[PDB]
Amino acid sequence: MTSEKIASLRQEIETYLNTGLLPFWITRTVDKENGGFLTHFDQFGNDSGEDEKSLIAQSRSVFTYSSAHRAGYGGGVLAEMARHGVDYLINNMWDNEHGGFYWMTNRKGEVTIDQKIVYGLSFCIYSLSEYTLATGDPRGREYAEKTFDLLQKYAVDTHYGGYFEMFNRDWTLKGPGAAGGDRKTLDVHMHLMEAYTTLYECTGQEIHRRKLLETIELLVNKVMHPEYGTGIPQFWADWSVAPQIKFDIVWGWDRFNPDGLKSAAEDNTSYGHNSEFAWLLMHALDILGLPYDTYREQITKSYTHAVENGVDWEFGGVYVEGSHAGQVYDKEKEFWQQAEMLIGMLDAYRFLKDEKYLQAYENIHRFVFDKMINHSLGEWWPLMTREGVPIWKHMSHSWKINYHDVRSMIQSIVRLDKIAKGV
Amino acid sequence: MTSEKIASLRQEIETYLNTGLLPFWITRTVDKENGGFLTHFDQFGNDSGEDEKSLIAQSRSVFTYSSAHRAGYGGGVLAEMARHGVDYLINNMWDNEHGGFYWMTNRKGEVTIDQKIVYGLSFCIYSLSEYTLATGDPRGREYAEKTFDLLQKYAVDTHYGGYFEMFNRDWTLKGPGAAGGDRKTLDVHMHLMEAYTTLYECTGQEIHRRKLLETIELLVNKVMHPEYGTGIPQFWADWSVAPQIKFDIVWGWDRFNPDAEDNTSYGHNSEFAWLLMHALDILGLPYDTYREQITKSYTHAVENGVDWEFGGVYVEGSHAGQVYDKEKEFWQQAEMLIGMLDAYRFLKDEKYLQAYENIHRFVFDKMINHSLGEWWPLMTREGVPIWKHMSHSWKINYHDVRSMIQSIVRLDKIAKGV
Numbered sequence: 001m002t003s004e005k006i007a008s009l010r011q012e013i014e015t016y017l018n019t020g021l022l023p024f025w026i027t028r029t030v031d032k033e034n035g036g037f038l039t040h041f042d043q044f045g046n047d048s049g050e051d052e053k054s055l056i057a058q059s060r061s062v063f064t065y066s067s068a069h070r071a072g073y074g075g076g077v078l079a080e081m082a083r084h085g086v087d088y089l090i091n092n093m094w095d096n097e098h099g100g101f102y103w104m105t106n107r108k109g110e111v112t113i114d115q116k117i118v119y120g121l122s123f124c125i126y127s128l129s130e131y132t133l134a135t136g137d138p139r140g141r142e143y144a145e146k147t148f149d150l151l152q153k154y155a156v157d158t159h160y161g162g163y164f165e166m167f168n169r170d171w172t173l174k175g176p177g178a179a180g181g182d183r184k185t186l187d188v189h190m191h192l193m194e195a196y197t198t199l200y201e202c203t204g205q206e207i208h209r210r211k212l213l214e215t216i217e218l219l220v221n222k223v224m225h226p227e228y229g230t231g232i233p234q235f236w237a238d239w240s241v242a243p244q245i246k247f248d249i250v251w252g253w254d255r256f257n258p259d260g261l262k263s264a265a266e267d268n269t270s271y272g273h274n275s276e277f278a279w280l281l282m283h284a285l286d287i288l289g290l291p292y293d294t295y296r297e298q299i300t301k302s303y304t305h306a307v308e309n310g311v312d313w314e315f316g317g318v319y320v321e322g323s324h325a326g327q328v329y330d331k332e333k334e335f336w337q338q339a340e341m342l343i344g345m346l347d348a349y350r351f352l353k354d355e356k357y358l359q360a361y362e363n364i365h366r367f368v369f370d371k372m373i374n375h376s377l378g379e380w381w382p383l384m385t386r387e388g389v390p391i392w393k394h395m396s397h398s399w400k401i402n403y404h405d406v407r408s409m410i411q412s413i414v415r416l417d418k419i420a421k422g423v
Numbered sequence: 424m425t426s427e428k429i430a431s432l433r434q435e436i437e438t439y440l441n442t443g444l445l446p447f448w449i450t451r452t453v454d455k456e457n458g459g460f461l462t463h464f465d466q467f468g469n470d471s472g473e474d475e476k477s478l479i480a481q482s483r484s485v486f487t488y489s490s491a492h493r494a495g496y497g498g499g500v501l502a503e504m505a506r507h508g509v510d511y512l513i514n515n516m517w518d519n520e521h522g523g524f525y526w527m528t529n530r531k532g533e534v535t536i537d538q539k540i541v542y543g544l545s546f547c548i549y550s551l552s553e554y555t556l557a558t559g560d561p562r563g564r565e566y567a568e569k570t571f572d573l574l575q576k577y578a579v580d581t582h583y584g585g586y587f588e589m590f591n592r593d594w595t596l597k598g599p600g601a602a603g604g605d606r607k608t609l610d611v612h613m614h615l616m617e618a619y620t621t622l623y624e625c626t627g628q629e630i631h632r633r634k635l636l637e638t639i640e641l642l643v644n645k646v647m648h649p650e651y652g653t654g655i656p657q658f659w660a661d662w663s664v665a666p667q668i669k670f671d672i673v674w675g676w677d678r679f680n681p682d683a684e685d686n687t688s689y690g691h692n693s694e695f696a697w698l699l700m701h702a703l704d705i706l707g708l709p710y711d712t713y714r715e716q717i718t719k720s721y722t723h724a725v726e727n728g729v730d731w732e733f734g735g736v737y738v739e740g741s742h743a744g745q746v747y748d749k750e751k752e753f754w755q756q757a758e759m760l761i762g763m764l765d766a767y768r769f770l771k772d773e774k775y776l777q778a779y780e781n782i783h784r785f786v787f788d789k790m791i792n793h794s795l796g797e798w799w800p801l802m803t804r805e806g807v808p809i810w811k812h813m814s815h816s817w818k819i820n821y822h823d824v825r826s827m828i829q830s831i832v833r834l835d836k837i838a839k840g841v
């Protein structure tokens with residue numbers, strides 16, 4: 001891929017990031033009346049009125065503004081916005097009796113769901129660690145560490161390893177099945193690898209290094225498919241595969257059958273998840289100062305599977321999910337999987353040096369810019385038909401904020417520059 | 424055994440406990456000048472001079488006095504002694520910057536080894552949880568929980584499970600080999616199960632219940648021999664068996680008996696089994712929850728470890744059943760007293776009561792130094808002392824007082840069952 005093409009792709013991202021995506025959030029999100037962030041915007045960019053400030057929404061905003069700022073974007077206001085978020089997290093969402101952050105507040109900042117959900121706590125560590133790295137405000141590291149310590153105490157399974165993932169306010173484990181107390185999941189464990197990476201970057205402490213590596217090992221040895229290297233979504237405590245169910249606590253709009261199961265509840269993998277894992281693993285290794293070769297086999301399997309099955313060569317973009325063995329189940333185009341495939345395919349090129357990953361990359365890039373970005377507003381359509389007709393028309397809500405897309409724009413520029421240097 | 428036999432065994436224990444063993448300690452150990460306990464006593468019961476107040480000696484002292492008091496012995500003085508030791512643990516041995524208890528102080532109470540040693544921290548959780556149950560003073564639970572949380576943060580391996588076991592003062596992992604940072608041991612993980620049982624008994628919180636069960640599962644699934652159910656002493660972090668090594672940090676003496684990596688300890692295995700049954704009692708779960716495991720430990724101990732000729736239990740032998748070391752060490756006798764009684768309660772086979780009486784007669788007739796009230800630490804197979812200290816930095820009164828008290832508890836259960 002020529003230097004001119006590299007530079008064209010990079011300029012397209014940068015101009016869109018600076019004049020479309022960040023302004024969409026900068027001009028809308030700060031709630032000065034109640035604190036924290038407004039994130040419910042309809043297809044016209046107007047508040048759609050939902051009475052929710054979710055942990056995911058608030059922490060993802062903190063992460064986005066901290067990380068965009070630390071990467072050099074937004075012109076200064078992003079750090080101030082992140083600090084605004086962190087105030088909300090601590091003053092409204094931190095449990096001062098039992099510790100940990102609450103799952104849901106309403107718009108006034110009152111607690112409506114007081115459960116302790118490791119998936120959200122993962123995003124608390126991630127975003128508050130990134131916030132301290134970006135601003136030097138020690139509150140971020142302080143609460144990331146508090147939350148890390150509570151996860152070790154209450155969530156780590158000292159026999160089988162890994163983490164139980166959903167608890168009541170008082171940290172007692174929730175019941176079985178949909179209540180979320182008896183499964184260990186790819187989604188939590190991968191995002192913990194992501195959070196621990198930044199926590200370690202922030203603190204430099206051995207325990208955080210040692211447990212980041214323990215988490216990588218868990219993912220690679222237990223969560224990934226033993227043959228195909230692809231992420232298996234759900235396990236019992238003993239790491240035997242569990243039927244993939246919807247939980248009572250959601251943080252996305254994942255499709256299930258009416259009984260709350262996936263159609264192939266035991267043979268279902270997500271190309272976006274697998275690409276996301278692979279590049280976040282490479283980023284952890286960078287932070288650890290280890291070569292990508294440390295997990296060459298795993299990284300190769302993740303990227304190879306994704307480009308072989310998940311890339312829609314004919315119409316552009318990445319499918320939703322499919323079989324570990326190769327069959328596609330759902331050819332719709334959901335926003336966050338495009339974002340994660342952008343980063344992953346550049347890193348697959350950087351590391352594996354196969355032009356097919358650059359071919360895959362521009363495919364996904366062209367789909368994102370020509371079909372998925374709602375250019376009049378600056379945000380991404382959340383769900384489209386295979387061929388790129390919008391199905392869902394919200395710009396954002398309690399679970400779709402700006403964590404995936406801002407990160408993929410910044411981190412795609414980052415890897416395009418590294419590619420450009422290698423001639 | 425007859426009601427009359429049980430009553431005699433019980434009275435032998437009870438008289439010795441009240442007139443011999445506890446007075447030995449009550450009259451010697453409280454150090455009012457420096458705080459804490461003196462535990463260095465020679466064969467004549469006199470101070471032998473050592474300049475050490477180990478974490479093991481102090482916390483084990485707190486446990487003995489807390490538990491003997493809670494079971495109703497000592498006419499009250501043992502709670503006052505336990506309190507004295509807790510004062511020392513907190514004010515001289517707790518690390519106010521990094522948390523956890525230091526491994527070693529000197530006689531004046533100054534820290535001399537500031538490492539964080541999980542084996543010692545186990546006994547901190549054990550003794551301090553017992554202290555709060557025994558006295559209602561919440562300092563015990565408070566530091567027991569603080570120690571537990573630190574172990575979850577710094578020592579639990581979130582990948583392979585179980586604990587790394589030795590750390591610098593600042594909780595950074597120590598180095599490989601003798602430094603202690605790359606092995607997982609039966610010693611630490613069995614005693615964590617012991618400690619967590621009393622911690623859960625103390626707090627009643629679900630997290631301690633859940634992690635007690637997890638520790639039991641680690642022992643049963645990772646530490647006990649896959650075929651024989653006997654304890655394997657050392658593992659790599661991945662739970663593959665490691666060559667047995669001595670660590671720089673010791674809590675005992677390496678006896679070289681002048682008369683191998685498949686060796687296991689009959690006393691450890693008996694100890695694990697009865698502590699497991701006690702954990703199951705605290706949990707409300709039936710013994711046969713782990714029937715196969717418990718049957719293996721006790722069966723292997725009675726078949727191979729009991730010296731029918733001279734009395735007492737041997738030191739160690741192979742998993743497959745060959746005896747290696749026929750010397751008579753004090754703590755294995757104590758743990759077989761409790762274990763053989765529990766083996767009879769659960770398995771109902773008469774050989775365990777024959778075994779018990781064998782160990783009991785060896786303890787009372789050969790091993791107790793009846794002029795002082797403490798046990799000889801190590802004897803030849805036949806019953807001649809090899810070492811003659813009564814107590815030091817690692818031999819206190821944890822094993823023996825507990826075995827007297829807990830043997831009475833179980834003899835009383837067996838007598839009702841007859």
Ligand SMILES: OC[C@@H](O)[C@@H](O)[C@H](O)[C@@H](O)CO
Pocket residue numbers: 187251252253273276336399400404
């Ligand atoms: O790894 C991707 C993430 O965990 C995804 O599963 C969430 O559902 C989505 O990011 C929320 O919009």
